[PDB]
RNA sequence: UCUGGUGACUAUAGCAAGGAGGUCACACCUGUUCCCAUGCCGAACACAGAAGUUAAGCUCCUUAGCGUCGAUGGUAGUCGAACUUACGUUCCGCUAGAGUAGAACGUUGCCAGGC
RNA sequence: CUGGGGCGGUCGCCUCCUAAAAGGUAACGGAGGCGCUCAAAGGUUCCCUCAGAAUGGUUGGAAAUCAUUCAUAGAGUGUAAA
RNA sequence: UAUUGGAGGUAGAGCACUGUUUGGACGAGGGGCCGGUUACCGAAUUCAGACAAACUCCGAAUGCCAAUUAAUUU
């Protein structure tokens, strides 16, 4: 429950997003009490490992910059054909 | 899963067959499911063939849910007629499908039996398919 | 339904055309309208 | 050419050139039709009138401005400064 | 003004503590009663209407207004606006004297086992009963009449629900 | 009281032999055989009944 | 069971239905009337700017006294006329609120007409 | 900000619930003789009156059950382009609907008495 | 006119969709109406709000009329459709 | 063309309306019978699903109309 992420930047076009999804990572955003609207990206495999480790709900340590955010998955996106995760939403409880 | 009991307008413009599944992309009722990967019509008669195959192959075992209903009527002109003079009469009922549209769902039966049943259904069906389980995680 | 020409009872001129049903109003329909000769409102009958 | 097969629907009316007739910002003279309609897609507002045919026409000279009435209804206005 | 007097000195007295109310304005008060004749088959008849107008205009102090049919109904001939039934409202003192009269003429002719009625209600405090014009017209005899009908009697009260209509049925009546 | 052309009512003294329940009314504008004052000086049109005498519950 | 209501909500339905044509301008302002179970008010208002230009009521101590309510209306009307003449208002549009033009509202209107206001 | 008119805003304004309060304003109320009053009630409407009472309407305060509003990120779609004949692919702008976080039990103008 | 003529159908007006979110836009394309009616179903003034549903009952073909809280108009608007 | 302002309901979505529909709750009507019971069957009421040229609580891209107005052209 100690997943890390990387900070997204502005104006990520269609090509950038689809390349990013075609590598082993997936974009996401965080929000909620205790933080602001930060857009990040996580590596898919470790997300899946964490989720099967904790399940649907889990107070997860999330790696952004230097600060770890107690966060749980509000909700998520999936591609049924070509099985691959598409966008994860995260809310912080703290 | 054959025909709509009544429709308002019986002669209708044919359906668009270009794009992606508007919905029904998930297993909701059953446990395992069968989705499509191309996009053809389904004529209210090939799904009948398919549910029979599955049901009779499970030997009246677990439950089945057909997820595609033939809503659209289609017309065919009478034989050896020229072009023009109106629109023809209804020949069958269809339901367009899209890549990603779940078609059939099953539950209350082992995994291998379900996969075999959906395989046998796939061959009575005009679209490439895929075996899927209840999405979780 | 029939066409009716209304005429000024005083002036005498046919100044208006209108309509009536001959079963609902079987009688000569009367009504006040403007006679443009007498600059006044007179009675006009479907005469 | 086929034969006896015949259809019972080959009929239509002549469309009426309804819709907008002026745009926000332009100078309309009084009387100018702004929006030919049926019923009330747009109600008259300030210095605007309702014809018998639900037509909307400016009462006076001025600029034309389309606006909101409540939640799901629109009006029209005309303002004279020019 | 009999039940009238019995209200402010006895209903106001007893019901005010049979149930707790913070002010005196919170007390059940009878507002009026609608005395609709109901519906008699005057499709081939039109006479049964003015005789029905005799009743109520005679029994109550006022004539029933003939509310014609709303929607057009088959089976019997009620076309949109067929004059049928009746309607009368008692608001002022007449509500009282007529009520009193009712409870002082109930027992002889109704032959009710309970005395007047039971759980004939609509669940919110209104009688929705029906008589067979047995008790009514004590004044004018059964001798000058021709049919057997019954009103859609209701209770218009500041009371809340028929549970309260029972405690105000202790207003001389028979629950 | 649907007024205007409303018919003639009266709070008459229904002075019956059974409790003299002269607290009623109606269109029974009959002869006042008992022109009393405690009750209405009107007809005691009620002459005999069981409302105050013989109930099936309280006989 | 039926619920009695205060008579003001229904009133404010008819007043708006009359306000639909009646709108006060600076040249021709609107005279409203607010009748209570014991009082009657009146305001002259230009709706093109949303400003009350004059006011008068049966509570206003100058007019408060002991009369028949129709009679103090005859005084509220007279006062509103005076206040308006000072500001320079001749023609007005009488808004009857949502009250039937009768009794008090009528009395007030008639009074304001006899005392100058041209409506 | 109280209190009452009046009107300006996309229900962030509403419904339901709980709880106050009648500051003399507000409704409730007594009655029909008085103009008036109702195809059919002093119901309402109108009217004369103010002895009863805040209970309800109303007012104020709470609460997001309920209503509405509602991003960011994205996805669908598509303008232009380049491939292409595929139920297409790529690039570049624009960018929904749905959903999720959340806003929200109003803001406000003039007038008259208030404090 | 006519997916060659012939046979069948059609021909002028109004409404809807096809029609690609201004307007316009064709086929022997998909649906329907018109050749009237109203001395009130016109003008104006003042009033009033509906269908259905249950908690229901003298009738109760069920629902006629009557009652009561919700009814966003689910009703009505002379007629086709918008 | 850049920047404002606006009319309109297509693509897409959605089921709030007209309908078209697949499973699951839940009480009940004629009726299996003696008004009946229980199955059901015609719906009421829900929860999850879907479909639409002549469905729309919503709603682009672009086109169109016009501007206190700019810049380049003719």
The nucleotide minimizing the C1' distance to residue B66's CA is J22
Of B27, B40, B65, the C-alpha closest to A80 is: B27
Every domain of chain G and the residues it spans:
21-110
Total domains, chain C: 1
Q: What is d(CA B119, CA E48) in angstroms, rounded to the nearest whole number?
A: 77
CATH of residue C34: 2.20.28.120
Sheet hosting strand C14-20, strand order edge to edge: C14-20, C2-8, C40-45, C30-35
Q: H or E stretch including F54?
A: none
Å separating the CA of residue A15 from the C1' of nucleotide I25: 39
Closest C-alpha to F55, from E60, A45, E172, G41? E172
Q: Which of E30, E1, E31, E27 is nearest to E13 (CA)?
A: E27
Residue G23 Cα distances to D50, G32, G46, G101, angstroms: 18, 11, 8, 18
Residue B37 near residue B65, CB atoms below 8 Å: no
F in contact with B (at least 3 C-beta pairs within 8 A): no
Rounded Cα–Cα distance for residues D36 and F51 (Å) = 76
The radius of gyration of chain E from alpha carbons, rounded to an integer in Å, stands at: 18
A-chain CB neighbours of B130 within 8 Å are 81
Conformation bin of residue B44: beta by default, left when phi > 0, alpha when psi is -120 to 50: left
Q: Is the dihedral of CA B62, B67, B72, B78 positive or negative?
A: negative
With an 8 Å CB cutoff and a minimum of 3 pairs, decide whether chains A and B touch.
yes
Cα separation, A61 vs B13, in Å, equals 55
Please say whether the beta carbons of E137 and E54 come within 8 A: no
CATH number at residue A29: 2.40.240.10
Distances from the Cα of C39 to the Cα of C18, C34, C35, C36, angstroms: 21, 7, 6, 5
Ordered DSSP codes for D12-47: -------EE-S-TTSEE-TT-EEEE-SS-SEEE-TT
| Best CA proximity match to F51, nearest among F13, F12, F22 | F22
Q: What is the DSSP letter of G103?
A: H
Resolution in angstroms comes to 2.5
Report d(CA F6, CA C6) in Å as an integer. Answer: 47
CB B87 within 8 A of CB B75: yes
Domain total of chain A: 1
Rounded to whole angstroms, the Cα distance separating G118 from B77 reads: 80
- Rounded to a whole number of angstroms, the distance from the CA of G79 to the nearest CA of chain E is 39
Subunits with 3+ Cβ pairs within 8 Å of G are E
According to CATH, what is the number of the domain G21-110? 3.30.420.100
Q: Does residue G32 approach strand H to less than 7 Å at its CB?
A: yes
Helix and strand element counts for chain G (H, E): 3, 4
Nucleotide I57: closest residue by CA–C1': E128
Full DSSP string of E23-73: SSTTS--EEEEEEE-----TTS-SHHHHHHHHHHHTTSSSPPP--B-SS-B
Contact residues, chain A, for B105 at CB < 8 Å: none
Of all residues in chain G, the one with the smallest CA distance to E164 is: G1
Cα–Cα distance measured from residue A71 to residue C41, given in angstroms and rounded to the nearest whole number: 88
Chains E–F, number of C-beta pairs less than 8 Å apart: 85
Cβ-defined contacts of G96-101 (< 8 Å, 24+): G96/G15, G96/G18, G96/G33, G97/G11, G97/G14, G97/G15, G97/G18, G97/G32, G97/G33, G97/G34, G97/G35, G98/G10, G98/G11, G98/G12, G98/G13, G98/G14, G98/G15, G98/G16, G98/G17, G98/G18, G99/G11, G99/G14, G99/G33, G99/G35
The answer to whether residues G97 and G9 touch, using CB atoms and an 8 Å cutoff, is no
Give the CA-to-C1' distance from G38 to I66 in angstroms: 38
Can you spell out the DSSP letters for A5-74? Answer: -EE--S---HHHHHHHHHTTEEEEEEEETTS--EEEEEEHHHHHHHHHHH-S---EEEEETTEEEEEEEE
Based on the number of CB atoms within 10 Å of its own CB, is G118 exposed (0-12), middle (13-18) or buried (19 or more)?
Answer: exposed
Binary contact (D1, B82; C-beta < 8 A): yes
Residue C22: give the domain boundaries. Answer: 1-47
Ramachandran sector of residue D7 (left: φ over 0; alpha: ψ -120 to 50; beta: rest): beta
Measured distance CA(A78)–CA(G6) in Å, rounded: 58
DSSP F44: -
Whether the CB of D7 is below 8 Å from some CB of chain B: the reply is yes
Nearest CA in chain A to B132: A80
From the CA of D40 to the C1' of J55: give the distance in Å: 22
Pairing of strands B72-76, B63-66: unpaired
> φ and ψ at E41, to 5 degrees?
-75, 75
B102 phi, psi to nearest 5 deg: -60, 140
Q: Which helix (H) or strand (E) holds G93?
A: strand G93-94
Give Dmax over CA atoms of chain C in angstroms.
34
> Does the nearest atom of strand H lie within 7 Å of D2's Cβ?
no
Positive/negative CA dihedral, F41, F42, F43, F47? negative
Q: How far is F33 from chain E (nearest CA, A)?
A: 15
Determine the structural domain holding residue A29 and report its residue range.
4-92
* β-sheet bridge partners, residue B123: none
In angstroms, how far is CA F30 from the centroid of its own chain? 10
CB of E41 under 7 A from strand I? yes
Q: Check if the beta carbon of residue F44 is closer than 8 Å to that of residue F29.
A: no
Domains of chain B: 23-137 (3.90.1170.10)
**Which residues of G spanning 68-87 put their CB closer than 7 angstroms to strand H?**
68-71
G9-17 contact pairs (CB < 8 A, 24+):
G10/G98, G11/G97, G11/G98, G11/G99, G12/G98, G13/G98, G14/G97, G14/G98, G14/G99, G15/G95, G15/G96, G15/G97, G15/G98, G16/G98, G17/G98
| Nearest CA among G15, G61, G18 for reference residue G39 | G61
Beta bridge partners of residue C15, listed in sequence order = none
CA distance A52 to chain B (A): 7
What SS3 state is found at E102?
A: helix
Contact indicator for G84, G54 with CB cutoff of 8 Å: yes
From the CA of G43 to the C1' of H16: give the distance in Å: 37
Among F3, F28, F50, the residue with its CB nearest the CB of E108 is: F50
B17 Cβ contacts chain H strand, under 7 Å? yes
Report the relative pairing of strands D74-79 and B102-107 from DSSP bridges.
unpaired
Which nucleotides of strand I lie within 7 A of protein CB? 2-11, 13-19, 22-25, 27-33, 36-39, 46-48, 51-52, 55-69, 82
Name the nt closest to E65 by C-alpha to C1'. H40
* Phi, psi for A63 (deg, rounded to 5): -90, 105
Nearest-by-CA chain F residue for E102? F24
For residues F57 and E106, give the distance between their C-alpha atoms in angstroms, rounded to a whole number: 13
Residue A36: which of A80, A13, A67, A76 has the closest Cα?
Answer: A67
**Mutation site for B-interface testing, chosen from D3, D5, D7, D8 by largest number of B Cβ within 10 Å:** D5
Q: Could you tell me if B93 and B10 are in contact, meaning their C-beta atoms sit under 8 angstroms apart?
A: no
- Count residue pairs from B and D with Cβ separation < 8 A: 15
- Compute the distance between CA of residue G84 and CA of residue G78 in angstroms, rounded to an integer: 10
Quote the Cα angle for G4-G8-G11, to 5°.
115
């Amino acid at each position: 429950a100690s997943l890390k992420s990387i900070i997204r930047q502005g104006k990520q076009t269609r090509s950038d997003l689809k390349q990013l999804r075609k590598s082993g990572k997936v974009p996401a955003v965080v929000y909620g009490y205790g933080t602001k609207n930060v857009s990040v990206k996580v590596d898919e495999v470790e997300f899946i490992k964490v989720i099967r480790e904790v399940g649907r709900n889990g107070v997860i340590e999330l790696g952004v910059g230097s600060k770890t955010i107690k966060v749980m998955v509000a909700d998520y996106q999936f591609d049924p054909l070509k099985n691959q995760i598409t966008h994860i939403d995260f809310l912080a409880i703290n | 899963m054959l025909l709509p009991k009544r429709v308002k307008y019986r002669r209708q413009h044919r359906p668009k067959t270009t794009g992606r599944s508007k919905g029904g992309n998930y297993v909701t009722f059953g446990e395992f499911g069968l989705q499509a990967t191309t996009t053809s019509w389904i004529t209210s008669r090939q799904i009948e063939s398919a549910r029979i195959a599955m049901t009779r192959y499970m030997k009246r075992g677990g439950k089945v849910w057909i997820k595609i209903f033939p809503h659209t009527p289609y017309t065919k002109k009478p034989l050896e007629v020229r072009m023009g003079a109106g629109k023809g009469a209804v020949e069958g009922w269809i339901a367009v499908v899209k890549p990603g549209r779940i078609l059939f769902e099953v539950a209350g039966v082992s995994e291998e039996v379900a996969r075999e049943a959906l395989r046998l259904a796939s061959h009575k069906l005009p679209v490439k398919t895929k075996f899927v389980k209840r999405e979780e995680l | 339904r029939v066409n009716v020409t209304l005429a000024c009872t005083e002036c005498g001129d046919r100044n208006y055309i209108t309509t009536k049903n001959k079963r609902n109003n079987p009688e000569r329909i009367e009504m006040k309208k403007y006679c443009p000769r007498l600059n006044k409102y007179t009675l006009h009958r479907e005469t | 050419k086929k034969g006896v097969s015949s259809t019972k629907n080959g009929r239509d009316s002549e469309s009426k050139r309804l819709g907008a007739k002026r745009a926000d910002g332009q100078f309309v003279t009084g009387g100018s039709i702004l929006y030919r309609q049926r019923g009330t897609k747009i109600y008259p507002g300030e210095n605007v009138g309702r014809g018998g045919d639900d037509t909307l026409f400016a009462k006076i000279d001025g600029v034309v401005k389309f606006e909101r009435k409540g939640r799901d209804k629109k009006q029209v206005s005309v303002y004279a400064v020019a | 003004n009999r039940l009238k007097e019995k209200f402010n000195t006895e209903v106001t007295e007893n019901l005010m503590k049979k149930f707790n109310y913070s002010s005196v304005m919170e007390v059940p008060k009878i507002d009026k009663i609608v005395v609709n004749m109901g519906v008699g088959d005057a499709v081939q008849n039109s006479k049964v209407l003015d005789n029905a107008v005799e009743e109520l205009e005679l029994i109550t102090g006022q004539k029933p207004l003939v509310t014609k049919a709303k929607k057009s109904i088959a089976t019997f001939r009620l076309r949109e606006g067929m004059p049928i039934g009746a309607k009368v409202t008692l608001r002022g003192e007449r509500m009282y004297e007529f009520l009193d009269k009712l409870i002082s003429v109930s027992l002889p002719r109704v032959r009710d086992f309970q005395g007047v009625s039971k759980k004939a209600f609509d669940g919110r405090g209104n009688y929705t009963l029906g008589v067979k014009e047995q008790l009514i017209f004590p004044e004018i005899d059964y001798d000058k009449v021709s049919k057997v009908r019954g009103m859609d009697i209701v209770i218009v009260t500041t009371a809340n629900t028929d549970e309260e209509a029972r405690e105000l049925l202790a207003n001389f009546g028979m629950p | 009281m649907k007024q205007g052309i409303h018919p003639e009512y009266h709070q008459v003294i229904f002075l019956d032999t059974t409790t003299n329940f002269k607290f009623l009314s109606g269109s029974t504008k009959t002869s006042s055989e008992m022109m009393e004052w405690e009750d209405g000086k009107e007809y005691p049109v009620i002459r005999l009944d069981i409302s105050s005498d013989s109930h099936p519950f309280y006989t | 069971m039926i619920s009695k209501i205060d008579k003001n909500k229904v009133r404010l339905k008819r007043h708006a239905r009359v306000r639909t044509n009646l709108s006060g301008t600076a040249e021709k302002p609107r005279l409203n009337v607010y009748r209570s179970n014991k009082h009657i008010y009146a305001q002259i208002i230009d709706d093109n700017k949303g400003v009350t230009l004059a006011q008068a009521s049966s509570k206003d101590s100058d007019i408060a006294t002991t009369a028949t309510k129709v009679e103090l209306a005859t005084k509220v009307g007279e006062a509103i006329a005076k206040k308006a003449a000072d500001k320079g208002i001749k023609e007005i549009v009488f808004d009857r609120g949502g009250y039937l033009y009768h009794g008090r509202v009528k009395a007030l209107a008639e009074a304001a007409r006899e005392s100058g206001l041209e409506f």
